């Protein structure tokens with residue numbers, strides 16, 4: 001059992017939960033790859049079983065009357081049609097567990113408070129879109145953001161899946177140019193490439209909210225326009241640097257990742273958008289300052305009058321920090337939920353403490369838990385971590401096109 | 402089987418073939434990753450030796466005829482009459498550079514070619530030891546124009562005790578225990594400060610009192626030695642615009658010189674082989690000055706900046722840390738003492754990875770330690786995928802001789 005130590009505290013735990021890691025990671029004793037971004041009836045049955053026992057154990061029905069009944073209900077259902085159906089409650093449990101087991105998420109102390117939308121009765125593209133709109137609106141809540149997931153029908157033998165061709169529900173457009181540059185978010189060119197050619201008249205703004213590409217089974221994907229009152233945005237200003245507002249920057253309220261596949265007791269859900277609220281550094285450092293994102297660092301450095309000719313002026317660091325201050329301030333001023341990296345990591349340490357008492361440990365990925373700036377300043381930096389894979393889980397899947 | 406690794410800024414993909422020669426084992430399995438953990442005989446002595454010789458002869462291209470199979474059979478034979486063998490001085494230099502070349506956690510390996518290897522294998526006592534060390538410091542400091550160096554004292558061998566340096570670094574500041582629970586000076590060094598005194602040292606009462614050296618000869622107790630004050634180049638810390646900074650009274654030494662690691666070459670072990678480079682500002686700026694249990698001047702600096710330290714979302718911690726790093730960088734350049742910032746350090750490491758990929762088909766790198774402790778994603782190494790593993794020759798950790 002792994003001996004993990006908090007070097008700022010000198011305290012020790014043993015990760016006993018790691019011993020149950022359902023799958024295998026990419027590391028071996030020969031070489032570690034923990035920095036890599038992307039590492040059948042009896043099969044479905046054994047996964048189904050392991051999950052249903054995990055549910056009844058969680059609710060303390062270990063060996064109960066109602067316990068042995070559901071087991072053979074699944075045994076029957078799977079025996080009859082290979083695949084099987086999740087009870088509503090089993091599905092809510094699945095959604096929370098998957099969030100909870102996500103090793104790269106720093107906001108897991110909120111895992112028990114998640115709202116699950118059951119859209120498993122969905123039938124078409126138009127019906128998907130409505131369900132999404134109710135999601136975006138429930139979850140935005142006029143700025144007071146709330147965590148939620150919307151699950152669509154599980155996968156079925158010999159048939160096209162429901163998919164969301166958008167990586168997030170709200171993504172800005174990315175337009176190529178005559179001089180090969182890019183207008184907008186360049187991470188989203190591949191999907192603007194599509195939406196435009198899927199029947200969408202394109203803008204030219206740096207911050208054009210993309211339409212939703214939604215796909216029903218077999219009868220191919222179908223475009224959808226978002227109502228602009230559904231999509232809450234924050235204009236970005238800085239608390240003492242009056243010129244920052246004039247850069248014309250903004251970001252959206254709602255981090256809503258869609259293109260991941262949810263897996264619960266052997267059932268795979270190709271479409272299941274989940275959303276929380278933003279950590280400041282994701283907007284400040286990754287979205288605005290990354291070289292192949294919006295890449296504003298230098299522009300801001302120039303306006304602060306910093307020496308951009310020499311790395312030793314640390315202009316990059318100085319600019320980056322004030323870009324993060326602008327983000328927080330802008331969100332607070334607009335009363336839209338936001339968390340800074342110090343508050344985030346501090347709550348995560350509390351989470352490790354919780355998980356230690358509750359489950360014997362916690363799957364955490366150090367390289368993603370540590371924030372993109374001021375790493376050593378946060379308390380997760382000097383905390384040793386163990387990464388592994390549990391079920392239920394969120395997985396990646398091939399780009400649906 | 403080849404580990405496919407990608408640079409996510411550029412989009413470039415390489416295959417780390419070198420990882421296949423992974424000598425040791427790490428703490429990771431497919432069950433779980435432990436990559437964030439800080440700390441994880443004639444027959445096989447000969448197998449280690451053989452592999453080492455085959456590296457060294459392949460180095461100078463001429464490999465597989467001359468004194469190669471000669472040296473092998475010579476080494477294979479030298480183990481027979483004795484057990485332990487001895488390196489050709491050119492083999493020592495080669496292995497010395499290799500051990501730097503191989504260290505997965507050092508962002509400064511662009512320079513591994515230019516290292517000055519001092520052969521102190523004929524060293525005989527604690528006093529000659531001290532003399533080699535003063536010379537090391539003298540050459541490496543070079544009035545502020547720093548040069549990479551390493552001095553190799555005699556290998557561990559049966560029937561003799563070890564040469565050992567008890568200090569973790571050649572230059573370190575003392576750390577006294579006050580009555581009020583606080584520590585005057587560097588808290589990291591309370592232990593070694595305890596020992597120095599118990600072994601006769603008459604201590605100081607300053608926050609930057611340079612420590613003596615405790616030097617150990619085989620089967621002999623460690624002897625105490627004061628570095629001559631004019632041998633230790635120190636830098637006063639001041640901020641290029643914040644004039645009140647200078648009244649914090651801070652300084653750091655010029656030369657990072659780690660003295661407590663084991664050097665392993667071709668099965669042979671050099672428990673005493675101190676090596677030094679030059680600082681990267683973040684080590685001094687963030688780690689030594691801002692860490693809670695190091696010198697811990699962050700809140701203190703923040704208040705003087707009239708930042709709002711009552712709330713995390715003001716980012717007072719980040720703001721104060723950046724100016725502390727600016728002070729370090731500016732002070733070192735003022736003093737004409739060699740230093741390097743994390744943007745420069747990392748950009749060169751990216752070039753190193755390009756060299757190493759062409760040279761050896763890979764490069765052992767520990768992501769969590771290469772990525773600077775502030776502004777991670779502002780540097781190119783953040784978005785570069787890496788493969789961590791153990792190759793020999795190597796610098797290794799070893800027990801405190803007490």
Ligand code: HEM
Pocket residue numbers: 099102104105106107108110114147148149274275276277278279282339344368394
């Ligand atoms: C409510 C507050 C939340 C916060 C503050 C938060 C924060 C974060 C952050 C900072 C990351 C790192 C992302 C990166 O570096 O790319 C992350 C990843 C992740 N989070 Fe959370 N998140 C929240 C809600 C949620 C919810 C509601 C779910 C699922 C139901 C979730 C599951 C995940 C997953 C699966 C990842 C890994 C995704 C990937 O790396 O592709 N989180 N989160």
Ligand code: HEM
Pocket residue numbers: 500501504506507508509512516549550551676677678679680681684741746770796
């Ligand atoms: C010349 C300029 C050099 C720079 C800028 C540099 C920089 C660094 C840094 C920043 C670290 C990480 C330390 C930490 O985060 O605590 C490191 C680790 C390391 N470096 Fe250096 N270094 C230099 C020279 C050298 C030389 C000459 C050697 C050996 C001959 C060396 C060997 C090592 C080793 C073995 C480690 C890992 C030690 C450990 O993990 O405990 N470096 N280096």
Ligand SMILES: CNCc1cc(C#N)cc(OCc2ccc3c(C)cc(N)nc3c2)c1
Pocket residue numbers: 167255256257259274275276277278279282
């Ligand atoms: C650029 N990094 C690689 C990357 C690629 C993709 C893809 N394709 C998705 C990624 O998900 C990060 C993520 C996911 C969900 C989040 C939620 C719910 C809340 C929150 N605050 N932050 C979140 C961050 C990250």
Ligand SMILES: CNCc1cc(C#N)cc(OCc2ccc3c(C)cc(N)nc3c2)c1
Pocket residue numbers: 035036037187290291292293367368369409410783784785786
């Ligand atoms: C947005 N998709 C394209 C893209 C663009 C840019 C740019 N410019 C950078 C990207 O890096 C993804 C990435 C790669 C490695 C990471 C590691 C080791 C750790 C970590 N915490 N996050 C990481 C994120 C991806």
Ligand SMILES: CNCc1cc(C#N)cc(OCc2ccc3c(C)cc(N)nc3c2)c1
Pocket residue numbers: 657658659661662676677678679680681684798
């Ligand atoms: C807190 N870190 C744990 C730690 C433990 C041990 C042990 N045992 C050794 C460590 O050496 C880091 C190091 C080593 C050599 C360096 C050289 C030559 C130059 C330079 N600029 N920085 C360096 C940093 C760090």
Ligand SMILES: CNCc1cc(C#N)cc(OCc2ccc3c(C)cc(N)nc3c2)c1
Pocket residue numbers: 007008366381382383384437438439589692693694695769770771
């Ligand atoms: C007790 N020794 C002194 C000491 C003091 C403090 C304090 N305050 C912190 C210490 O941990 C260093 C450490 C721990 C984990 C690290 C990880 C995962 C990655 C990385 N790049 N560097 C790391 C450095 C050590």
Ligand SMILES: [Cl-]
Pocket residue numbers: 255282287
């Ligand atoms: Cl995002």
Ligand SMILES: [Cl-]
Pocket residue numbers: 657684689
């Ligand atoms: Cl140091």
Ligand SMILES: [Gd]
Pocket residue numbers: none
């Ligand atoms: Gd101006």
Ligand SMILES: [Gd]
Pocket residue numbers: 642643644
């Ligand atoms: Gd001033």
Ligand SMILES: [Zn+2]
Pocket residue numbers: 027031032033034429433434435436
């Ligand atoms: Zn690993």
Ligand SMILES: [Zn+2]
Pocket residue numbers: 285286290372778784
């Ligand atoms: Zn990034």
Ligand SMILES: [Zn+2]
Pocket residue numbers: 376382688692
């Ligand atoms: Zn530290």
